[PDB]
Amino acid sequence: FQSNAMFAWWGRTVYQFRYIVIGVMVALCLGGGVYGISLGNHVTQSGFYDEGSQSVAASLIGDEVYGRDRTSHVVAILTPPDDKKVTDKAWQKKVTEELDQVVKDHEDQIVGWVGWLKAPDTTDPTVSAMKTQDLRHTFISIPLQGDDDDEILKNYQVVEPELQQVNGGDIRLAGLNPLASELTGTIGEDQKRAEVAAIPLVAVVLFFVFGTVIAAALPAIIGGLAIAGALGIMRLVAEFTPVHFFAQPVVTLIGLGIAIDYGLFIVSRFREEIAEGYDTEAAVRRTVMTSGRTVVFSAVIIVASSVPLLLFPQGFLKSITYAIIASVMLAAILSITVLAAALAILGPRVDALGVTEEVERGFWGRLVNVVMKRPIAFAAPILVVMVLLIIPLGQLSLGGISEKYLPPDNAVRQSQEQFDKLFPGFRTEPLTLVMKREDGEPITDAQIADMRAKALTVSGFTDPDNDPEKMWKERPANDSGSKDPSVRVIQNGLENRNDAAKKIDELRALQPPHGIEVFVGGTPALEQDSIHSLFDKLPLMALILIVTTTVLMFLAFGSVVLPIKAALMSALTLGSTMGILTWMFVDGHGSGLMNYTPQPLMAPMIGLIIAVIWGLSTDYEVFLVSRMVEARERGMSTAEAIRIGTATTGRLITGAALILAVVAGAFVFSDLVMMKYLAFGLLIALLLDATIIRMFLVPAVMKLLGDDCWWAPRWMKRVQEKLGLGETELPDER
Numbered sequence: 001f002q003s004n005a006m007f008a009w010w011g012r013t014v015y016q017f018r019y020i021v022i023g024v025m026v027a028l029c030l031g032g033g034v035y036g037i038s039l040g041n042h043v044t045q046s047g048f049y050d051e052g053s054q055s056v057a058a059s060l061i062g063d064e065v066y067g068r069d070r071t072s073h074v075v076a077i078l079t080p081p082d083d084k085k086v087t088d089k090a091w092q093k094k095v096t097e098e099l100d101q102v103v104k105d106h107e108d109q110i111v112g113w114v115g116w117l118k119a120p121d122t123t124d125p126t127v128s129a130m131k132t133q134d135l136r137h138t139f140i141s142i143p144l145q146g147d148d149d150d151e152i153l154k155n156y157q158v159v160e161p162e163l164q165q166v167n168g169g170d171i172r173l174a175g176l177n178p179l180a181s182e183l184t185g186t187i188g189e190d191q192k193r194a195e196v197a198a199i200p201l202v203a204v205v206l207f208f209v210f211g212t213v214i215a216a217a218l219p220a221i222i223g224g225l226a227i228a229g230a231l232g233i234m235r236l237v238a239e240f241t242p243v244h245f246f247a248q249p250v251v252t253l254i255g256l257g258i259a260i261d262y263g264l265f266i267v268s269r270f271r272e273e274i275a276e277g278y279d280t281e282a283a284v285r286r287t288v289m290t291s292g293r294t295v296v297f298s299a300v301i302i303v304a305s306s307v308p309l310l311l312f313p314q315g316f317l318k319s320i321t322y323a324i325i326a327s328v329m330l331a332a333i334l335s336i337t338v339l340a341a342a343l344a345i346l347g348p349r350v351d352a353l354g355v356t357e358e359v360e361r362g363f364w365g366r367l368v369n370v371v372m373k374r375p376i377a378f379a380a381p382i383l384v385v386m387v388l389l390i391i392p393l394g395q396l397s398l399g400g401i402s403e404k405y406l407p408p409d410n411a412v413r414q415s416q417e418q419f420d421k422l423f424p425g426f427r428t429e430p431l432t433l434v435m436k437r438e439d440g441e442p443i444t445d446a447q448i449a450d451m452r453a454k455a456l457t458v459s460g461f462t463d464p465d466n467d468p469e470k471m472w473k474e475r476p477a478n479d480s481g482s483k484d485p486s487v488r489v490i491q492n493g494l495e496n497r498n499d500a501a502k503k504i505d506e507l508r509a510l511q512p513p514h515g516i517e518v519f520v521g522g523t524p525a526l527e528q529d530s531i532h533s534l535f536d537k538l539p540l541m542a543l544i545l546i547v548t549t550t551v552l553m554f555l556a557f558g559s560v561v562l563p564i565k566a567a568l569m570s571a572l573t574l575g576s577t578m579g580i581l582t583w584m585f586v587d588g589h590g591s592g593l594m595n596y597t598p599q600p601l602m603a604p605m606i607g608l609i610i611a612v613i614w615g616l617s618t619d620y621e622v623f624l625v626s627r628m629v630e631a632r633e634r635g636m637s638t639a640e641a642i643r644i645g646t647a648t649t650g651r652l653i654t655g656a657a658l659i660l661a662v663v664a665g666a667f668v669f670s671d672l673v674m675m676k677y678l679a680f681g682l683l684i685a686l687l688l689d690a691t692i693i694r695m696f697l698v699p700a701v702m703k704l705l706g707d708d709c710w711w712a713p714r715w716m717k718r719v720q721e722k723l724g725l726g727e728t729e730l731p732d733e734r
C-alpha cells in the first residue's frame with residue numbers, strides 16, 4: 001500500500017551491500033551489450049500493413065500460387081562508353097561475357113540476368129522496348145535468389161561490389177533492393193553520426209551544470225550501460241517476433257536522453273542533501289526515497305503512456321513499443337540501483353578530484369512574481385496563439401514509402417528518377433483481382449470473362465491498347481508457383497493514383513459471379529487498408545491514453561482539477577506541435593534549408609508522435625505539480641507554493657531540456673525523412689512545452705483557478721488516496 005517502507009528498505013539494503021549490486025549489474029549489463037552487439041542481421045525491414053487484412057491475404061495467395069515476381073529486384077542501365085550506339089557488337093560481346101562470368105561466380109544468389117542484350121537481334125515487341133530510340137541507352141534486369149525479403153536483401157548486399165564494376169563502372173543500378181540497402185545504410189550512418197556528434201556536447205553541458213568531472217561522468221556511464229542493456233534485451237526478444245529495423249535509433253535516442261536525465265537528477269539531489277553534513281548512509285536513504293520515487297513514477301507514466309500503441313496491428317509499432325518499454329524500465333532500474341551503489345562506495349569524494357544559485361533563483365522568482373500580477377494578460381495571448389497554430393491540421397494527407405524519403409541530391413534516388421525518365425511505363429502498380437475457387441475445383445473458362453465484364457463498369461483505369469478487349473489482363477505465372485486450376489488472378493492498373501480508395505471499395509462491393517470470392521490486394525490496396533485500420537482504431541487509443549494518464553496522475557497527489565489542467569496543457573502542446581510539423585513537412589516551408597522534399601506524412605507515425613508527445617508533456621507536469629504540492633502540504637499559501645515550486649524546478653528542468661534537445665538536434669541532421677520528422681516533433685514539443693507553457697501559462701491558469709485546486713470530493717479522495725500510496729511527507733531526524 002504505502003510503498004514508502006519499501007523504498008526505505010531498498011535504501012538501507014543497497015547500503016548494506018553496495019558491492020554485490022554494482023558487481024552483478026555491471027557484469028550483467030556488459031554481457032548483455034556484448035551479446036546484443038549483433039542486433040543486426042536479425043532486424044526485418046518489414047511490417048507496415050494490417051497482417052489480418054483482406055488484401056494481404058490476397059497478395060499471399062497470389063504470389064504463392066503464381067510465384068513471387070523477380071523482374072524488378074535489380075535493374076541496371078548501361079551505356080556504351082565510347083559515345084557509340086548500343087548495337088556495337090564488340091562492346092556488346094564484352095559486356096555480355098562479363099555479365100555471364102559474374103553470374104557464374106555467385107550463381108547461388110543470382111537466378112540469371114535477362115534483357116535485350118540476350119539475343120539483341122530479337123524481334124519481340126516488348127523486349128524491343130528496353131532500348132532508347134537514339135540507341136544510346138539500354139538496360140537489363142537481374143533477378144536475385146531468395147525465399148523472403150531479408151534473404152534477397154542479404155544476397156544483394158553480398159553481390160553488390162562485384163556488380164557495381166561492369167564495363168568501366170558506368171552501370172547504374174536501380175529498383176527495389178538498392179532502395180532498401182540505402183535506407184538501412186542511412187540508419188547505420190545515423191547511429192554513427194549521432195553518437196560521435198552527441199557524446200561531446202552532452203559531456204560539455206553536463207560538466208557545465210555541476211562544476212566537477214566525476215559527478216558529470218557518472219550519468220554518461222549509466223547511459224552507456226542502459227544502451228548496452230536495451231540492445232541486449234532487444235536482441236533477446238528478436239527470436240520470438242520480427243523486430244523492425246527502426247528500433248536501433250529509438251534505443252540510442254531514449255538511452256541518451258532519459259538515462260542521462262535520470263542520472264543527473266539523482267546525482268543533483270545527492271549532492272544537495274550531502275551539504276547538510278549527513279552521513280553517506282542517511283544521504284543515500286533520503287535520495288533513494290524522494291528522487292527514486294519521482295523517477296520510478298516518471299518511468300511508470302512513460303510506460304503507461306507508450307503501451308496503448310499495442311492496439312494497432314502494424315508490426316512496425318510493436319517493435320517501437322518494446323524498445324521504449326525495455327529501455328525506459330532498464331534506465332530506471334540502472335539509475336536507482338547503480339547510482340545508489342556508486343554514490344555509497346564514493347561518498348564525499350564526489351566534489352574534489354576535478355578541480356583544475358542566488359542569481360538564477362532570483363531570476364525565476366522575479367519572473368513568477370511579475371507574471372502572477374495579472375493572469376489574463378498572460379493567459380489570453382498565449383492561448384489564442386496556440387489555438388490558432390492548430391489550423392494547419394486541415395491539410396493532412398498520408399501515404400506510403402517511396403524513393404522521395406532521401407535528399408534530392410542522393411545517388412540512388414537520382415539513378416531511380418533517371419531510369420524512370422528514360423524508360424517510362426516499366427514501373428507500374430496494378431490492382432490484382434485474385435479469385436479463389438469455392439466450387440468447381442477447376443475454374444472453368446468464361447467465368448473470368450463474365451468477371452471482366454462485371455469489372456469493366458468501373459472508370460478511371462488505364463488502357464494503353466485503347467480497347468476493352470485487352471483490359472484486366474492476366475498476370476504472368478513464373479515457374480516457382482503451384483499453378484493450380486482453382487486460383488487464377490487478373491489485374492490492371494489505374495491512372496489517378498490518389499483516388500485509389502474509391503475504386504478499391506467499389507471493387508470490393510462488386511458481387512462475384514458465383515460462389516467464388518474476390519479480392520483486390522494490390523499495393524495501393526495495402527496502403528489504403530493500413531490507413532483505414534489506423535484511423536479506425538485511433539479514437540480508442542486516444543481515450544485510453546487520456547483515462548490512463550489522468551487516473552495515474554490523480555493517485556500521485558489527491559486532486560481532481562489538477563489532472564484536468566494537465567490534460568488540457570498536454571492536448572494544446574500536442575495540437576500545436578502537430579500543426580507546426582504539418583506546416584513544415586506538407587506545406588513545404590523550410591524545406592530547402594533542411595534539404596528534404598515536401599510530401600504526405602508517413603502512415604504509422606501519427607500514432608508514435610502522439611504517444612510520445614503526450615507522454616513527455618504529462619511527465620513534466622507530473623514533476624512540477626509534485627514539487628508544488630510537496631511545498632503546499634504543510635502551511636504555505638497558493639502563490640508562495642507556486643513561486644517556490646517554480647524556483648526549485650527551474651535549473652533542473654532547464655538542464656533536462658538542454659540534454660534532450662541536444663540529443664534530438666544531433667538526430668535532426670539525418671537523411672531518412674522519418675528521422676527528421678520525429679526529431680522536429682521532439683524538439684518543437686520540448687521547447688514550446690517547457691519554456692512557453694511552463695513559465696508563461698502554468699502560474700497564470702493556476703492563479704486564475706486559485707485556491708480551488710484540490711476541490712476533490714471527500715469520499716473518493718479519502719477511501720482511495722489514503723488507503724494506498726499516501727502523502728508520506730519525509731520526516732527529518734537527527
Ligand SMILES: Cc1c(C(=O)NCCN[C@H]2[C@@H]3C[C@H]4C[C@@H](C3)C[C@@H]2C4)nn(-c2ccc(F)cc2F)c1-c1ccc(Cl)cc1
Nearest residue numbers: 250253254257261265298612616619623656660663664682
Ligand atoms: C518519453 C521521452 C522523454 C521524457 O518524457 N523525459 C522526461 C524528462 N525527465 C523527467 C524526469 C526526471 C527529471 C525529474 C522529472 C521526471 C522531470 C524530468 C527531469 N524524453 N524523451 C527524449 C529522448 C531523447 C531525446 F533526444 C529527446 C527526448 F525528448 C522521450 C522519448 C522520445 C522519443 C522516443 Cl521514440 C522515446 C522517448
